[PDB]
Amino acid sequence: DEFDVVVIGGGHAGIEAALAAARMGAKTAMFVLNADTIGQMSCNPAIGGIAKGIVVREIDALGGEMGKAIDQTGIQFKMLNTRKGKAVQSPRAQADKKRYREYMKKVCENQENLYIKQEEVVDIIVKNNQVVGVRTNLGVEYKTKAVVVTTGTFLNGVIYIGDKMIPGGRLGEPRSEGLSDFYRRFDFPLIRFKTGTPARLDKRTIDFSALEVAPGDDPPPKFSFWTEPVGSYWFPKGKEQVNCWITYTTPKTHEIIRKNLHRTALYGGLIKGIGPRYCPSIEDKIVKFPDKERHQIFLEPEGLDTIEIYPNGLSTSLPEEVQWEMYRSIPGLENVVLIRPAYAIEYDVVPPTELYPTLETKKIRGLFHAGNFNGTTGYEEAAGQGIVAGINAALRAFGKEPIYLRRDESYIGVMIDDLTTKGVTEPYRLFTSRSEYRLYIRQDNAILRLAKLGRELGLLSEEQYKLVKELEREIEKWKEFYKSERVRSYSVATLMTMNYTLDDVKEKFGYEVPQHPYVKEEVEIQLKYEPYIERERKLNEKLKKLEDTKIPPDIDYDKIPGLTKEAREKLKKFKPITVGQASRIDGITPAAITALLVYLGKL
Amino acid sequence: DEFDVVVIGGGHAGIEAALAAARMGAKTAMFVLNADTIGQMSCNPAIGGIAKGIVVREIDALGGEMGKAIDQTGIQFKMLNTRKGKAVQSPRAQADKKRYREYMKKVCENQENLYIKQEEVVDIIVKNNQVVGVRTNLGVEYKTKAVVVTTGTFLNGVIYIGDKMIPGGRLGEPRSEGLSDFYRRFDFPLIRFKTGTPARLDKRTIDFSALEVAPGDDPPPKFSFWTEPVGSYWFPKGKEQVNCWITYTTPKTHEIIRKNLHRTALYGGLIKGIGPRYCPSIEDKIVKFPDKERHQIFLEPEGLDTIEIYPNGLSTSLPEEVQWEMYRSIPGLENVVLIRPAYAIEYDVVPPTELYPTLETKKIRGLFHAGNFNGTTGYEEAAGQGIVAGINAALRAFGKEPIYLRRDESYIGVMIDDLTTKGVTEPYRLFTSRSEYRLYIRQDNAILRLAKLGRELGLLSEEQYKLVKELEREIEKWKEFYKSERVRSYSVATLMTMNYTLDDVKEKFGYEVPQHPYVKEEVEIQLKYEPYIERERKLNEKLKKLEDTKIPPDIDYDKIPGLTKEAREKLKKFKPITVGQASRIDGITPAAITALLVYLG
Ligand SMILES: Cc1cc2nc3c(=O)[nH]c(=O)nc-3n(C[C@H](O)[C@H](O)[C@H](O)COP(=O)(O)OP(=O)(O)OC[C@H]3O[C@@H](n4cnc5c(N)ncnc54)[C@H](O)[C@@H]3O)c2cc1C
Ligand SMILES: Cc1cc2nc3c(=O)[nH]c(=O)nc-3n(C[C@H](O)[C@H](O)[C@H](O)COP(=O)(O)OP(=O)(O)OC[C@H]3O[C@@H](n4cnc5c(N)ncnc54)[C@H](O)[C@@H]3O)c2cc1C
């Protein structure tokens, strides 16, 4: 039959995209190679982290699932980097791979207008650069208005272990092959990225005696402003949480890796690294920091019913023989046994630059990319892209105009922007990026920042938006209050900026305090941070000014006065939507930008 | 008339290349836009540093000048990173920009077979992919066998200040334009890199009262195993040295820069950094490190007779008005005045991958690139490339075969390899690279490691090689000695590994201290490190085994069994010379490498 939107992929990106596009009312066909793998978590057994955490909340705020999901199936939540402030924190729960998968799968089945299909999409049918359909490897064709590609680590994937190559997209699964011809056919740049993962350990064979413990936090935090408790962002003290364990590599582990560097496809270059704990393979951790003698390693539970341990911080592509020797050089694992070997995955990727901040292909209309296929890596980073892609894919199908998240309003917008404008040299991660609005884009205000875009599209219930609209309205009342009261003589509001929690203001000064968990921790923040937020908003006024100046999708970049010839072209290939964006293009200089502003400064 | 080798460039790359190519006996035409700028130091007023230092010694050991140069014209030497060991140290002297320039200039004039030319080369004449000549912007042509391009920051250069563009290759100088058409004509990939430099301050307007002092070291070190004292690597205590001063930025400085990031072509990349002390601009240290509140700044003397201060760690491309406000927000510079504004330079560069480890273009025979035109940045990193390029350009001209420095024998080889094999995304620096033989490629054994390649080519005097061959032969004798003597009863040799300097072995155990200065500090090292050096040599045996397996320049990468089709190609475009090298190519995997090793058997 026919479809409005076809989502090639059942992964994280696929889901969010498919769900949204459907929830917005589009007949959505979500293709998958193996239905039983819908929502499968293939690497670290956790959702959230430094930057990731924030993203989730946004996806949640927007009406996506990833939030709700990790919550109901999480087995160990906690807030990271607690000794710095509330704005610079981020939630990172542990997950039950099994239950998570089942969850997401269940949702997709039970979602109106979302039809699942287990056929490998091989081609994209295009008439005059407009998506018209999709064709599977079973000689079947389908009529669709929009397509959202999210192949992740599958397109012509190759598993690397030792010096062995094995066709596939994930250890044990097949791979996709056909769809790449369509891409080379139309001349999209194709490049390959390869990432690694740690093997899987036998819990039974590990010695958890002389090892630290990383419990969750009580009360534990929650990734959704929709789960129970509703409207809140926390779990009632006393929830069941599992424990992770910590061991460290040793001088011997290294000598082992070193001895076999010529046997691993993850032996990157010898360049002074960004940080011991920013590098992927454990092979880098010793190539880039030839002076550190031990790196932290997180043994993580993959679920409740499983004896499978995840040795976080130990991904590699060393021979399997070697993989044993080195896993057993670690304290606690001297007798461990592997259930699945660690390995490396290489896969086809189409440079983000080939898209607009709407995630729509510049060359073809109706085609949207997202996920690892977009140069990213991580469940979250991928999820973020999906929802945007899906939302737009929908609108594109519906006959409306695509939307986009500004880099100064959602940490997602940041990613999508850093991607469609600066491209990628290696897999793009979030805990690598920074926001020129690190204080306005917090891990809490998220719901407030995006909730409206939500209700606007439909991804958010009418009733849902009111709880937000209502909760917020109240957050400012309580603030206008502390602003007017006094205590020299300062304002209670002005107090939060002096290590004054709305809890010390209730005791030391016997004042009232908000009676809804969110409004209290929210009002407490906004007031403690309102100053710094402004200094920040100010130091960027100029930047925002640009980001606010729109550039027509028709202007001829030649009719532009005193605009270098070289830049005339980059400006035609990126077709920036805002002057600000146009200024972030590498090559386009302040000089060029002015000459451009002048042009527009007549029109 | 005609030439064997034409060296387009009078910069550092140009020099070493030109000098060598000529010293080896080739009619060498070294072209320059402005003769008075031969050997001009355009950025930091110093030679050496973390990685750089070592390179120099190598170029010195090979017969290049840069070493000798910095020595006789240096105004403040010193060894960096002294609290870690002797192998992990590196010499970094301050220079007298003026004196240095004059020096190198002098040398080139007085060098047999080296003819200077102040004409802008515009084209390279090629018949059947073979360099046959060069053509200047004056409608003149020249017959040459080889060409060594080293345009540095000039090919279609553009100076950026605030939002102003100014054609040129350096503040105040012109630029090159024509030569780039030759490159696009033949399909070379052309990309642009831009770097920045700090302005220049009026020494008279600075307050050097409440600021630290960074004197040289006594005795100070020397970058040449040829200057005085000969054979040694040290200067007799008591030499004249200048002093640098240290101030730090302030929270205000930053708010200034921040306020003006929309007016500086150097702002970009919210990516987390590798350390503040590693970024170029100062507009970075406040974008990549939004939490640090003060960065060290080294006020450095540009010479003896000059009142020009170099604010190390403050390069920027901010408007000139802003440049004032932010230079005057710094402690000591509240009243300073600028002589030259700081700025940014953007310039044409042809991706290194377009060359072999011999620095010869893959597409055209007889054409060699080097310097910043090759994706590099820095006097040293550029110098290193030149000498190799020149050496080969020579041999190519002479009708012999090009040579190359292996990555496990010279830190230079490292650079050249990191470049011709992994290409560049941004300007390549040395203090960013690491060597899988950090202990065997030290800042002293250099002379020993390369000396022979030197005499082999001619760049080193016959009598020069003997001093080396002789000094070395003696370094081992004295070792054979400490190895056999005892003390339970360990060996004196085995003692150096226990914080035993051949100085404590002369006092505490009344033994004999070596003949001359080098043999003493050398034997003292080699013995203190002989262990670690071996553990290292071993952990890499496998890697070297590959690096030793040679790949014929003829083999059809198709006739190779079970070698993925995608890799068949990359292996065609890099035409690796070594299997080891072939393994460093991004894309070529251990899988592919084995399938290859099988083929070759
Ligand atoms: C080996 C390995 C290493 C990793 N390393 C890291 C890391 O270092 N850091 C990090 O953050 N994350 C890492 N990850 C996580 C990775 O980012 C996610 O696993 C996932 O691939 C990203 O989400 P996605 O939605 O793009 O794709 P996926 O979740 O992988 O889903 C892709 C889906 O597309 C379908 N598909 C593929 N081709 C076709 C086709 N032609 N037709 C129809 N359907 C198709 C598949 O069935 C699959 O369901 C790693 C994963 C692996 C497997
Ligand atoms: C703005 C700026 C920023 C810098 N930043 C850094 C930094 O961050 N870190 C660092 O280590 N170093 C930095 N440097 C130093 C720089 O790397 C060296 O000055 C130089 O580029 C390296 O040596 P070279 O021989 O390749 O080129 P150059 O020293 O530039 O010399 C090239 C020579 O070739 C001649 N020439 C050019 N084109 C032609 C032609 N077509 N025909 C004939 N002759 C020609 C010129 O006259 C010139 O003398 C910077 C320099 C500048 C100017």
User: What are the DSSP calls for B81-114, one per residue?
Assistant: --SS-STT-EEEEEE-HHHHHHHHHHHHHTSTTE
A431 vs B contacts (CB less than 8 Å): 272
- DSSP collapsed to 3 states, A385-420: HHHHHHHHHHHHHHCCCCCCCCCCCCHHHHHHHHHH
Whole-number Å distance, alpha carbon A264 to ligand 1 midpoint, is: 21
Alpha-carbon span B342 to B353, nearest angstrom = 32
Residue whose entry in the numeric block shows the structure tokens 């070697």: A322
Alpha-carbon span B452 to B449, nearest angstrom = 8
Peptide bond into A561 cis (omega under 30): no
The HSE-up count of residue A555 (CA atoms within 13 Å, CB side) is 23
Residue whose entry in the numeric block shows the structure tokens 């056909």: A178
Degrees to nearest 5, angle at CA A399 with A396 and A404: 40
Q: What are phi and psi of B171, to 5 degrees?
A: -55, 125
Alpha-carbon span A176 to A288, nearest angstrom = 34
A 548-567 near B (Cβ less than 8 A): 564
Q: Are A141 and A133 in contact (CB under 8 A)?
A: yes
CA distances to B249, B287, B293, B327 from B256, in Å: 11, 13, 13, 10
Burial track B19-37 (b if 16+ CB lie within 10 A, e otherwise): bbbbbbebbbbbbbbeeeb
The HSE-up count of residue B104 (CA atoms within 13 Å, CB side) is 31
Of A259, A272, A543, the CB nearest to B434: A272
Inter-axis angle of helices B66-73 and B52-62, nearest 10: 110
Query: What is the distance of C-alpha A347 from the center of its chain?
Result: 19
**Closest ligand to residue B137's CA:** 2
Of A259, A275, A433, the CB nearest to B539: A259
To the nearest 10°, the Cα dihedral for B469, B473, B476, B480?
170
**Which residues pair with residue B6 across a beta bridge?**
B29, B147
Who's near A560: CB < 8 A, 6+ residues apart? A568, A595, A596, A599
Inter-axis angle of helices A12-23 and A97-109, nearest 10: 30
Whole-number Å distance, alpha carbon A372 to ligand 1 midpoint, is: 6
> Which candidate, B295, B325, B265, B313, places its Cα nearest to that of B45?
B313
**With a 6 A CB cut-off, is A42 part of the ligand 1 pocket?**
yes
A272 vs B contacts (CB less than 8 Å): 274-275, 278, 431-434
Count Cβ atoms within 10 A of the Cβ of residue A35 and give its class: 0-12 exposed, 13-18 middle, 19 or more buried: middle
Alpha-carbon span B253 to B160, nearest angstrom = 21
Ligand 2 pocket mutation, candidates B104, B151, B381, criterion most atoms within 8 A of CB? B151
> Which candidate, A407, A509, A403, A516, places its Cα nearest to that of A458?
A403
CA distances to A586, B159, B278 from B266, in Å: 10, 12, 15
Alpha-carbon span B411 to B416, nearest angstrom = 9
Phi-psi domain of A21 (left: phi exceeds 0; alpha: psi -120 through 50; beta: other): alpha
Q: Residue A343 is encoded by which pair of tokens?
A: 């390995």
Handedness of CA B389, B158, B425, B60 (dihedral sign): positive
Topology classification of domain A550-603: DNA polymerase; domain 1 (1.10.150)
- Name the binding residues of A for NAD(+): 275-289
- DSSP collapsed to 3 states, B207-253: CCCCCEEECCCCCCECCCCCCCCCCCCECCCCCCCCCEEEEECCHHH
B 252-271 near A (Cβ less than 8 A): 255, 258-265, 268-271
Alpha-carbon span B587 to A98, nearest angstrom = 34
Collapsing DSSP to helix, strand or coil, A233 comes out as: coil
Q: Residue B433 is encoded by which pair of tokens?
A: 């690279």
The HSE-up count of residue B384 (CA atoms within 13 Å, CB side) is 33
Q: Are B227 and B72 in contact (CB under 8 A)?
A: yes
Nearest CA in chain B to A167: B564
Alpha-carbon span B340 to A61, nearest angstrom = 53
Does domain B198-342 fall under CATH 2.40.30.260? My reply is yes
Q: What is the DSSP letter of B135?
A: E
**Number of Cβ within a 10 Å radius of residue A562:** 12
Alpha-carbon span B264 to B342, nearest angstrom = 11
Start-to-end CA distance of chain A, whole Å, equals 48
Interface check A274 vs B, CB under 8 A:
yes
- DSSP collapsed to 3 states, A88-131: CCEEEEEECHHHHHHHHHHHHHCCCCEEEECCCEEEEEEECCEE
H helix count then E strand count, chain B = 18, 21
**With a 6 A CB cut-off, is A8 part of the ligand 1 pocket?**
yes
Q: What is the DSSP letter of A65?
A: S
Nearest CA in chain A to B429: A271
> Which candidate, B324, B301, B298, B322, places its Cα nearest to that of B311?
B298
Pairing of strands A141-149, A2-8: parallel
Q: Residue B153 is encoded by which pair of tokens?
A: 């920051």
Peptide bond into A590 cis (omega under 30): no
> Which candidate, B147, B109, B119, B118, places its Cα nearest to that of B19?
B109
Number of the ligand 1 atom closest to the C-alpha atom of A344:
1
Q: Where in chain B is the domain with CATH 1.10.10.1800?
A: 461-549
CB contact under 8 A, A589 and B265: yes
> Which candidate, A217, A215, A227, A212, places its Cα nearest to that of A79?
A217
**Residue of A50, A257, A272 to mutate, testing the B interface (most B Cβ within 10 Å of its Cβ):** A272
Q: What are phi and psi of A368, to 5 degrees?
A: -125, 135
Nearest CA in chain B to A535: B255
Interface check A165 vs B, CB under 8 A:
yes
Whole-number Å distance, alpha carbon A429 to ligand 1 midpoint, is: 14
Alpha-carbon span A315 to A307, nearest angstrom = 19
Who's near A157: CB < 8 A, 6+ residues apart? A167, A168, A169, A170, A175, A176, A345, A346, A347, A348
Chain breaks in chain B (C to N over 2.5 A) after: 487
Q: What's the residue count for chain B? A: 601
CA distances to A101, A448, A476, A519, B574 from A522, in Å: 33, 10, 10, 5, 58
Residue whose entry in the numeric block shows the structure tokens 């498919």: A18
> Which candidate, B36, B23, B25, B3, places its Cα nearest to that of B68?
B23
Q: Where in chain B is the domain with CATH 1.10.150.570?
A: 550-601
> Which candidate, B208, A572, A461, places its Cα nearest to that of A596?
A572
Of B438, B543, B593, the CB nearest to A261: B543
Q: What is the resolution of this structure in A?
A: 3.2
Of B262, B288, B594, the CB nearest to A542: B262
**Which residues pair with residue A158 across a beta bridge?**
A167, A346
Q: Residue A580 is encoded by which pair of tokens?
A: 């600000």
> Which candidate, A585, A451, A574, A421, places its Cα nearest to that of A518?
A451
| Percentage helix, strand, coil for chain B under 3-state DSSP, each rounded to 5 | 35, 20, 45
Who's near A83: CB < 8 A, 6+ residues apart? none
What are the strands of the beta sheet with B191-197, ordered from one edge? B164-167, B158-161, B343-349, B191-197
Q: Are B75 and B301 in contact (CB under 8 A)?
A: yes
Q: How far is A258 from chain B (nearest CA, A)?
A: 6
Whole-number Å distance, alpha carbon A274 to ligand 2 midpoint, is: 28
Alpha-carbon span B194 to A347, nearest angstrom = 32
Who's near A576: CB < 8 A, 6+ residues apart? A421, A551, A582, A585
Q: Are A151 and A373 in contact (CB under 8 A)?
A: yes
Burial track B271-289 (b if 16+ CB lie within 10 A, e otherwise): bebbebeebbbbbbbbbbb
Q: Residue B488 is encoded by which pair of tokens?
A: 């339970």
Nearest CA in chain B to A165: B591
**With a 6 A CB cut-off, is B183 part of the ligand 2 pocket?**
no
Ligand 1 pocket mutation, candidates A37, A372, A387, A431, criterion most atoms within 8 A of CB? A372
Chain breaks in chain A (C to N over 2.5 A) after: 487
Q: How far is B595 from chain A (nearest CA, A)?
A: 9
**With a 6 A CB cut-off, is A45 part of the ligand 1 pocket?**
no
> Which candidate, A120, A138, A116, A118, places its Cα nearest to that of A176?
A120
**Number of Cβ within a 10 Å radius of residue A438:** 15
Rg of chain B on CA atoms, in Å = 25
Q: Residue B475 is encoded by which pair of tokens?
A: 């370094």
Q: Residue A230 is encoded by which pair of tokens?
A: 């509703």
Count Cβ atoms within 10 A of the Cβ of residue A516 and give its class: 0-12 exposed, 13-18 middle, 19 or more buried: middle
Nearest CA in chain A to B268: A584
Q: How far is A590 from chain B (nearest CA, A)?
A: 5
Inter-axis angle of helices A462-484 and A517-539, nearest 10: 70
To the nearest 10°, the Cα dihedral for A553, A555, A558, A561?
-130
Q: Are A245 and A299 in contact (CB under 8 A)?
A: yes
**With a 6 A CB cut-off, is A385 part of the ligand 1 pocket?**
no
The CATH homologous superfamily to which domain B550-601 belongs is: GidA associated domain, C-terminal subdomain (1.10.150.570)
- In CATH, the number for domain A461-549 is 1.10.10.1800
Alpha-carbon span A564 to A588, nearest angstrom = 9
Alpha-carbon span A186 to B275, nearest angstrom = 42
Q: Residue B223 is encoded by which pair of tokens?
A: 């970058």
Alpha-carbon span B525 to B529, nearest angstrom = 6
Q: Are B323 and B305 in contact (CB under 8 A)?
A: no
Give start and end residues of each alpha helix (H) in B341-458. 379-398, 411-422, 446-457
Q: Where in chain A is the domain with CATH 2.40.30.260?
A: 198-342
> Which candidate, A342, A91, A338, A83, places its Cα nearest to that of A221?
A91
Residue whose entry in the numeric block shows the structure tokens 């563009």: B165
Alpha-carbon span A182 to A178, nearest angstrom = 8
Alpha-carbon span B239 to B215, nearest angstrom = 12
Handedness of CA B231, B234, B236, B239 (dihedral sign): positive
